Amino acid sequence: QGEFDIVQVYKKFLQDDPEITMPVAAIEALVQLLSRSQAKTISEFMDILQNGSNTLKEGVQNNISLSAGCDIFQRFVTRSLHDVGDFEQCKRHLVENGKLFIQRARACRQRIAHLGYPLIRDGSVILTHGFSRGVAAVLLAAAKRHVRFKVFVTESRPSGSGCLMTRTLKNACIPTCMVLDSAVSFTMNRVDLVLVGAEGVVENGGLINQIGTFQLAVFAKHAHKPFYAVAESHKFVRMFPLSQYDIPFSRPILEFDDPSPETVHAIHNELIMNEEQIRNNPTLDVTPPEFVSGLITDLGIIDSKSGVSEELIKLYL
């Protein structure tokens, strides 16, 4: 025994609590892996969590926010770390400061809401894409402050999380109206604000999120309506995509057939790409910074898209 496959602890916290995301889980797992460990050398400690993180990192399909969160977590611990006199101070300073990170981490989604809801104005019309706990909190925190507004929701192929985000709002008695992915443009004139979540923030102030994010951002630009994206600090990644396309591909993406001569000889909701060819379609798009009116984080609301990097560089020690 000792420390079992911490993915279990990881997986347990997801069931012990579903209202917490994947990043905050591993951080809650490593601290345990740090706590239930006796290393006697600083080397063994960091030799563990590297293998600890990579295992978690190799566990989930190299999820960005997770692989982001873990790497940030390490550098926070090893930053102010120092060995003086005794040794238990090491493990002490680790788990103590490690515990502090989580406390600061889980409370991030609250800070955002407290800063986001003033964006929602009485009678305004909001547009979001897919499901995103960040968008949820701010929108709910709006209604709980009693403001009148209506929101649209994107079908969010292939994730289909639009149906879910549609529900999660209706259960808070706020209006809804699902817009299928091919008709966001038709609605932009009717909106006054565009809100969206973020699965990943990059060095150029970019915006990695679900496949349809950049779809909305350009429409907002062309329709002179603002674009706001909610992102938790621990999602800042140390990568720089050149164009709006160079991102790592777990699968291969967007390939063609090689059709040799084989003849093989208005609402049609059943006509849909099969699960095989959907896997050929991508899952993430990246929104350049030029299209982001403002990035809202626990660090505050960031409009610079040059200070995004400075704030990011502040993170990776």
């Binding site: 600083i42 960091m46 590297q50 550098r75 090893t78 930053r79 102010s80 770390l81 060995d83 020690l317």
Partner: peptide
């Protein structure tokens, strides 16, 4: 050099492994 330290090797002992923390 890595995200957590500087893997080294000590010459006076047949280049055995060793790690130096960034802070130190």
């Amino acid at each position: 050099i890595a995200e957590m330290g500087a893997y080294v090797k000590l010459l006076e002992y047949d280049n055995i492994e060793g790690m130096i923390l960034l802070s130190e």
